[PDB]
Design a binder for this molecule. Structure first.
Ligand SMILES: [Mg+2]
Ligand SMILES: [Mg+2]
Ligand SMILES: [Mg+2]
Ligand SMILES: [Mg+2]
Ligand SMILES: [Mg+2]
Ligand SMILES: [Mg+2]
Lengths: 96, 57, 159
RNA sequence: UCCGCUGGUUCCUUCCGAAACAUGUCGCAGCAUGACCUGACUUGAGAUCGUCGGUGGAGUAGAGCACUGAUUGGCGAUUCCGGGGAUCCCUCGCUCGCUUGUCAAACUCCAAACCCCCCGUCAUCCUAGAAAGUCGGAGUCCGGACUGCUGGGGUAAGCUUGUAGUCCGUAAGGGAGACAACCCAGCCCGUGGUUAAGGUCCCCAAGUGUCGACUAAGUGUUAAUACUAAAGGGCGUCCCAAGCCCCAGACAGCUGGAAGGUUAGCUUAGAAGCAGCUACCCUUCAAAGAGUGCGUAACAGCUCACCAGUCGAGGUUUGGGGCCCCGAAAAUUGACGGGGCUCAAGUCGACCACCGAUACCACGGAGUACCGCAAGGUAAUCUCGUAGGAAGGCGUUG
RNA sequence: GCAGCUUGCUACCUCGAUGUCGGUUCUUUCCAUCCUGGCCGUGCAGCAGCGGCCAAGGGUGAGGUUGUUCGCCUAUUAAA
């Protein structure tokens, strides 16, 4: 039977480009966001902790608040709203 | 009424050339006659019988 | 089994050796024929395919044998250089219960082709061109697809 | 008695109108919860079925060998890990590099078109109430088919199991010979008009229509289609291109020539050009040969190849195309829908006129939705319908 | 490639019933020809063979074992 764990079908989803593997840039981890500021979900495989479920890959949410070193996002899946915790290392601003 | 026609048509999976001489009262009818004759002879339509020149002879 | 059982391309490829098991060997022994060390044949003709299909290795072996016999009989042992191109990488499986767990098991090997894709190639002199055409026409008779002959190099010489 | 299993369940109109799917189940002919349908109420301003531009997600098609596995020969060496036959006398496969020829669903240095989230813009809906929320009533969890995905499996199947769109189910009317789901069209009633699909020799309304060619087989006269035969061949016929010889003369014939030497090497006697080595048997003349055949123990002439005189205009080799022919045999009598059809009533490329729906236009009428105190106003953006929800009426006895 | 005459594959119709195998009787259809009619080739002297083409008008039987179809065997026969 097929499994239904939390990392299924992520062979290429959670990979790094060949000229990207290793230590990722550190400035991406100290970026700071404010309220109501659209961001993009782009999971960085190099960081093991604070990773949202990879089904939210490539979605855009808005910041709602901060809990420690993690921002609270508001992502739409289908017709629902899902609140996703993610460290700022996996996030990326929207360029207007 | 004599005329000269030159062009290329898609015979099968390749491009050929022709120099048919068609009798006709004028030149537009010469082009039409060329198209009709090629349709009769090779089953092609008016999209693979590109006529380069219909110069009078 | 009959030839038409495994000749159409309807399903995905199935070629990874390390996952399947027990693929039987092949019969075709040598893929180069004739004078390999020569490189000065001015005419280079070849047999091409008019439709996608699968060719069993046995058909390729029969075609190679017949072309070899004809070419050696007429042109000579040192007057040509034949070279087969397509190698059989596909695998053929035959179910053998009914439809209960109908997935098959390996029975042979096949080589897929594509339209206008060269299969054989013969190089000869100017005096043995007709013999080359005569040889390549029999080889295409054992082959499971319509085939036409194209003179690739030295077309102005022969034509 | 009980059953999740079979049969039956009685009047009219009006408004709206599905699911044959997911999870759990001693669950698979059942049921619960959710998706989908319907009625009412609360709140009070936005929403996104669509277009364009941008910030992002790609790892599929295709393509390729840069990783992982395979794969074809040539060349140069591994002075190994190796098999062939006391200096391992030396052969040398596996292997490592340069070049050639193939691959991949569980390969990728590459890499689309669809598609998804968000921002701006246009566009449509909306105070006659967007988005959201609360409560009442359900049906449904036997599906099927067509067009795409070379979908997966299977020899294949009107097979089985997926996915996107649209349909039948529950869809009239027009056309396909008849046709659940194919083409036009989604339908209140009556009258007039013009068209769509499709057709115009007769059956059958409207063309024995026009222009240019092809087919000689009754081939064909069959959009899709579960209903239509293949490889191979044709000096059958209609076209295009490319070479070669050519009126001081090309091809088919009329002619003879093919004489020098030889009776080639040959043992059987003899395979004397035609069992078996060779070579152009003539310095030389068109011709003259080691040469096919009637003949041929051997031959021999007759003469093959091969040229020469002769007529008197085109001849010849190949490649790519259209139609047709052979390949092609089944059981009641018979299926282009039928009659029949040959410069067509068939095929190919174009064109003109007309016929033909409930579609579209106009007029009159009914009902409905919403608003308005009423009178009445708006409706291209209202009128199909099974399970089912809701509203108003008719009838029988008291 | 053709046929659907062997066995498979599928589950489209029939479970408020479409009465199974073999033989017997009687009628008919197909040709992919066993004999009878006509032709062609031969490594066809004659006789008799071998191979192929047209042709479905007529014929294609009697018995022993076995439930058998199928198949084996016997003596005839133009062929059984
Ligand atoms: Mg690919
Ligand atoms: Mg139920
Ligand atoms: Mg449809
Ligand atoms: Mg419908
Ligand atoms: Mg209808
Ligand atoms: Mg109802």
């Amino acid at each position: 039977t097929n499994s239904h764990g939390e990392k299924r079908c992520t062979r290429y989803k959670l990979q790094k480009t060949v000229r990207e593997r290793g230590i990722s840039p550190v400035s991406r981890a100290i970026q700071e966001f404010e309220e109501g500021q659209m961001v993009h979900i782009d999971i960085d495989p190099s960081v093991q902790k604070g990773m949202p479920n990879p089904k939210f890959q490539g979605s855009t949410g808005k910041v709602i608040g901060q809990r420690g070193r993690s921002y609270v996002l508001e992502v739409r899946s289908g017709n629902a709203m899902k609140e996703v915790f993610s460290l700022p290392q996996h996030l990326k601003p929207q360029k207007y | 009424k004599s005329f000269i026609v030159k062009g290329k048509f898609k015979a099968g999976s390749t491009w050929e050339k022709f120099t048919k001489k068609i009798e006709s009262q004028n030149e537009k009818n010469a082009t039409d006659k060329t198209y009709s004759i090629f349709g009769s002879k090779h089953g092609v339509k008016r999209s693979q019988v590109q006529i380069e020149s219909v110069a009078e002879e | 089994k009959p030839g038409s059982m495994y000749r159409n391309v309807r399903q995905r490829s199935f070629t990874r050796r390390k996952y399947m098991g027990g693929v039987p060997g092949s019969q075709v022994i040598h893929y180069d024929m004739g004078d390999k060390a020569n490189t000065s044949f001015p005419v280079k003709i070849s047999l091409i395919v008019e439709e996608k299909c699968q060719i069993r290795h046995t058909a390729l072996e029969a075609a190679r044998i017949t072309a070899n016999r004809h070419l050696v009989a007429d042109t000579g042992k040192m007057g040509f250089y034949m070279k087969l191109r397509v190698y059989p990488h596909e695998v053929i499986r035959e179910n053998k219960s009914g439809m209960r767990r109908a997935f098959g098991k390996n029975v042979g090997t096949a080589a897929r082709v594509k339209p206008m894709q060269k299969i054989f190639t013969v190089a000869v002199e100017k005096q043995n061109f007709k013999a080359a055409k005569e040889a390549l026409w029999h080889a295409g008779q054992k082959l499971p697809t319509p085939c036409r002959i194209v003179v690739d190099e030295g077309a102005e010489l022969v034509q």
